[PDB]
Design a protein around this ligand. Structure first.
Ligand SMILES: *[C@@H]1O[C@H](CO)[C@@H](O[C@@H]2O[C@H](CO)[C@@H](O)[C@H](O)[C@H]2NC(C)=O)[C@H](O)[C@H]1NC(C)=O
Ligand SMILES: *[C@@H]1O[C@H](CO)[C@@H](O[C@@H]2O[C@H](CO)[C@@H](O)[C@H](O)[C@H]2NC(C)=O)[C@H](O)[C@H]1NC(C)=O
Ligand SMILES: *[C@@H]1O[C@H](CO)[C@@H](O[C@@H]2O[C@H](CO)[C@@H](O)[C@H](O)[C@H]2NC(C)=O)[C@H](O)[C@H]1NC(C)=O
Ligand SMILES: *[C@@H]1O[C@H](CO)[C@@H](O[C@@H]2O[C@H](CO)[C@@H](O)[C@H](O)[C@H]2NC(C)=O)[C@H](O)[C@H]1NC(C)=O
Ligand SMILES: *[C@@H]1O[C@H](CO)[C@@H](O[C@@H]2O[C@H](CO)[C@@H](O)[C@H](O)[C@H]2NC(C)=O)[C@H](O)[C@H]1NC(C)=O
Ligand SMILES: *[C@@H]1O[C@H](CO)[C@@H](O[C@@H]2O[C@H](CO)[C@@H](O)[C@H](O)[C@H]2NC(C)=O)[C@H](O)[C@H]1NC(C)=O
Ligand SMILES: *[C@@H]1O[C@H](CO)[C@@H](O[C@@H]2O[C@H](CO)[C@@H](O)[C@H](O)[C@H]2NC(C)=O)[C@H](O)[C@H]1NC(C)=O
Ligand SMILES: *[C@@H]1O[C@H](CO)[C@@H](O[C@@H]2O[C@H](CO)[C@@H](O)[C@H](O)[C@H]2NC(C)=O)[C@H](O)[C@H]1NC(C)=O
Ligand SMILES: *[C@@H]1O[C@H](CO)[C@@H](O)[C@H](O)[C@H]1NC(C)=O
Ligand SMILES: *[C@@H]1O[C@H](CO)[C@@H](O)[C@H](O)[C@H]1NC(C)=O
Ligand SMILES: *[C@@H]1O[C@H](CO)[C@@H](O)[C@H](O)[C@H]1NC(C)=O
Ligand SMILES: *[C@@H]1O[C@H](CO)[C@@H](O)[C@H](O)[C@H]1NC(C)=O
Lengths: 121, 415, 187
């Protein structure tokens, strides 16, 4: 949250973004898919000497369907694909001893802890 | 009872998808700009790191919900400049290229209805607000691509490569799905468009009027902006100390005595922060539970035709259109409701020559003098023939079989 | 790990070791030190319990979805779009992974599309013929009727379409002829 100065140390290729101040990354005019998110539609990536650049991410290739009021497109051939999907179902089962964790082997500590009502149970 | 007319109806549905990303600084909020409090908070073990980690996990999840909802097309489809959809008028929901932020009319209404210094005091107290990853002008491009792919390719654009097809035949295919023949569309097409446009027109008039429809999308904003006020009020409390300002305590007391007062203050500010963190952790799960439902509805009602009752609106489902609203998505469901009804006397079968004739796809009816067979969800009587019913058994076991004749179209031709 | 690390913290006491406080302090002075350590560790345990209670529900929300997917995608064929994988759904297989399940979805995607010039209906002698199940297409000269998801051209016959009314209300209807298979065999 610093407008870009107010920053202590400056350098080369100081960049001002809607997400803050970016130091050390060149600014380009192209637009690729997002690699390292920054904010406000700005993404940075490392590429070709090699340098870190920051751009405005591109949503994807743009095409226009050849839509006409008396035209249809019929497929003639197919492909059988197979995908995978991972789902967690359960996690580990843990259990603690409230007396052992707080006090341990001491006996006066148990007597002092007994005042608290039923937290352990 | 058989219906005669029908009616096309469009209804809205609001769904929150994400909330605002915030991040508080444990050391800055609890202590301020002092080092004695820093040393004491260091004497406390690791309570600040867990809070900073949780309040970052929430903010990361908030940017995955929006991606999962909207970012479902791998292309950016564009509507053709020439608008010929058979009479349907989509100007209200398709983007307006005039205003710099490419948003439609209804999207602008929705943006103006919702109302998002209070911020400055929080800002100068260790609080901050991170910006969303996808700017709204880029969500209003995902929604535009989805809506432009729906009205030119059907459900095919979500199951491979987009394949064009005229909108009239798309409506015919969507009628044929719910149990109405194709010819009901073409012989009434001019009507249906006039029923659709009006249906859209009453939606915007329902938004610009004095109505409370965005309440479910305003409640989350109110709750999130309300919790911060309590989090800040909790900073102005004694908690058992002499005064609520750490500067005064460090100004009129030596360390060996001010230590106990600073400890009393820390043991209350830390708890006031923990309560807020837990509340946010619960609200995040609620909002994600809503965002996943939004994604499922987006993928099933929009990118296809649903057959689950009362999922994508009341009635039978034809299609849906998405729109973006601040921190939420608004669906417009288009449905099909039968309108005008008539009584008839029906039978399960027809005994012709000792043979029971059952309908192939339809229902037997009679207007009191003659018997016809018609489809279930519309009134279109047809003559009973052998190319329209199938025989099974003999007219002895059916409970309510009646007497009638069958045309048998093949015989007269040979004559 | 963090739950263990909280043990090595004074929480304001003289020494984080419980025994070393009582080893070199009288009872009624060390009582307050022990009482401070007790509440510090108790709060450090309550935090862990609450975090586990939240994460358990987060996991169960996915366990129910896995049960639903096993019921619908595996034990049958689904029609909800993008539920059991991208494309039209055919069948799935389950596999087991440490603390979770892995679904292998088999799906069907069309590959090679071709353009065609279409028509809503054909009217023959003042009767409008609509396709029973399929679409009218053409390669520029002749008209055929095909299924929607695969190009298999087939000649138009009377037992391939159905009639409803005259060709005066249908918008984009076009002339052609219908085979009427009965007549040549009647000869
Ligand atoms: C950050 O602060 C600087 C300092 O005011 C702003 O720069 C000013 O911009 C205006 C508009 O072009 C100029 O007229 C001033 O001369 C600039 N001031 C200086 C000192 O250069 C800048 O606009 C601020 N940035 C943001 C994003 O608010
Ligand atoms: C549909 O696509 C498949 C793609 O595999 C075509 O099958 C290929 O045909 C070429 C030419 O005969 C062979 O060299 C390849 O080995 C085939 N692939 C496989 C996996 O066997 C198929 O011919 C296409 N359909 C039609 C009607 O041409
Ligand atoms: C089925 O379609 C509509 C149902 O609203 C009817 O069309 C309207 O009929 C009224 C009554 O004459 C006219 O004033 C309107 O101009 C018609 N059009 C519209 C858009 O309202 C139609 O009559 C119904 N058919 C039957 C047999 O009832
Ligand atoms: C679709 O709806 C729009 C919006 O109602 C119609 O546009 C109107 O056209 C008239 C004719 O000149 C103008 O006076 C209005 O100002 C237009 N409305 C707006 C909001 O600009 C349009 O005619 C309808 N039909 C089509 C085919 O687009
Ligand atoms: C029930 O519908 C039948 C339709 O067939 C009506 O019968 C028609 O009546 C008109 C009136 O003169 C005749 O011109 C038609 O030839 C009849 N159709 C036939 C014989 O198939 C019948 O009138 C209707 N009944 C009622 C009570 O409305
Ligand atoms: C429906 O048609 C059948 C077949 O014509 C009728 O069955 C016969 O009806 C006559 C009428 O008196 C009886 O004498 C016969 O015993 C019946 N059974 C036969 C011929 O096997 C039937 O009655 C008709 N249903 C009616 C009139 O309601
Ligand atoms: C459109 O398809 C038809 C049907 O295959 C083509 O007509 C055939 O053309 C071949 C070669 O000219 C002849 O041997 C057949 O006898 C024709 N069959 C019929 C039923 O006419 C037609 O040529 C195709 N059109 C184009 C432009 O290729
Ligand atoms: C489809 O066929 C009908 C019947 O052949 C055509 O109707 C004829 O149109 C011409 C042009 O005005 C008239 O002069 C004739 O009187 C019509 N009736 C006939 C020939 O019986 C119709 O135009 C055709 N539609 C097309 C080719 O799009
Ligand atoms: C990007 O384009 C702008 C004009 O739109 C130009 O002023 C700027 O210099 C360009 N940046 C680079 C790195 O060439
Ligand atoms: C059918 O007849 C009953 C008998 O009175 C009547 O109440 C009902 O309204 C009729 N159905 C319709 C659709 O009018
Ligand atoms: C179908 O027609 C469009 C419009 O001319 C064209 O861009 C496209 O390439 C055609 N399809 C094929 C497979 O060539
Ligand atoms: C399609 O639209 C054009 C106008 O661009 C029109 O001339 C043509 O008749 C339309 N198609 C049909 C089948 O009517």
């Amino acid at each position: 949250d610093v407008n870009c100065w107010r920053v202590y140390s400056t350098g080369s290729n100081v960049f001002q973004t809607r997400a803050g101040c970016l130091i050390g990354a060149e600014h380009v005019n192209n637009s690729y898919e997002c690699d390292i998110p920054i904010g406000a539609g700005i993404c940075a990536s490392y590429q070709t000497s090699q340098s870190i650049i920051a751009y405005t991410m591109s949503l994807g290739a743009e095409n226009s369907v050849a839509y006409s009021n008396n035209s249809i497109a019929i497929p003639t051939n197919f492909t059988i694909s197979v995908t995978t999907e991972i789902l967690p179902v359960s996690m580990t089962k843990t259990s603690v001893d409230c007396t052992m964790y707080i006090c341990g082997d001491s006996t006066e500590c148990s007597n002092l802890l007994l005042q608290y009502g039923s937290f352990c149970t | 009872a058989i219906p005669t007319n029908f009616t096309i109806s469009v209804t809205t549905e609001i769904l929150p998808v994400s909330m605002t990303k915030t991040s508080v600084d444990c050391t800055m909020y609890i202590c301020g700009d002092s080092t004695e409090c820093s040393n004491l908070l260091l004497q406390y073990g690791s309570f600040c790191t867990q809070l900073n980690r949780a309040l970052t996990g929430i903010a990361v999840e908030q940017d995955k919900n929006t991606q999962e909802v909207f970012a479902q097309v791998k292309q950016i489809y564009k509507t053709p400049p020439i608008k010929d959809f058979g009479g349907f008028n989509f100007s209200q929901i398709l983007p307006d290229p005039s205003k710099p932020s490419k948003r439609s009319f209804i999207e602008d209404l929705l943006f103006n209805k919702v109302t998002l210094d209070l911020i400055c005091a929080q800002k100068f107290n260790g609080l901050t607000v991170l910006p969303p990853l996808l700017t709204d002008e880029m969500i209003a491009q995902y929604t535009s691509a989805l809506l432009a792919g729906t009205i030119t390719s059907g459900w095919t654009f979500g199951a491979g490569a987009a394949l064009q097809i005229p909108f009239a035949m798309q409506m015919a295919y969507r009628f044929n799905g719910i149990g109405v023949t194709q010819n009901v569309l073409y012989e009434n097409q001019k009507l249906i468009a006039n029923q659709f446009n009006s249906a859209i027109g009453k939606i915007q008039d329902s938004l610009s009027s004095t109505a409370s429809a965005l309440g479910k999308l305003q409640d989350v904003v109110n709750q999130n902006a309300q919790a911060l006020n309590t989090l800040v009020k909790q900073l102005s409390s004694n908690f058992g100390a002499i005064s609520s300002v750490l500067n005064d305590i460090l100004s009129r007391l030596d360390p060996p005595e001010a230590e106990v007062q600073i400890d009393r203050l820390i043991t209350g500010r830390l708890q006031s922060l923990q309560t807020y963190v837990t509340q946010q952790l619960i609200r995040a799960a609620e909002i994600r539970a809503s965002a996943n439902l939004a994604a499922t509805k987006m993928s099933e009602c929009v990118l296809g035709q649903s057959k689950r009752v009362d999922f994508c609106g009341k009635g039978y489902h034809l299609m849906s259109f998405p729109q973006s609203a601040p921190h939420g998505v608004v669906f417009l469901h288009v449905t099909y409701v039968p309108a005008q009804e008539k009584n008839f006397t029906t039978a399960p079968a027809i005994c012709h020559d000792g043979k029971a004739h059952f309908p192939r796809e339809g229902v037997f009816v009679s207007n009191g003098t003659h018997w016809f067979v018609t489809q279930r969800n519309f009134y279109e009587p047809q003559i009973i023939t052998t190319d329209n019913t199938f025989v099974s058994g003999n007219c002895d076991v059916v409970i309510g079989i009646v007497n009638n004749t069958v045309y048998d179209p093949l015989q007269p031709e040979l004559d």
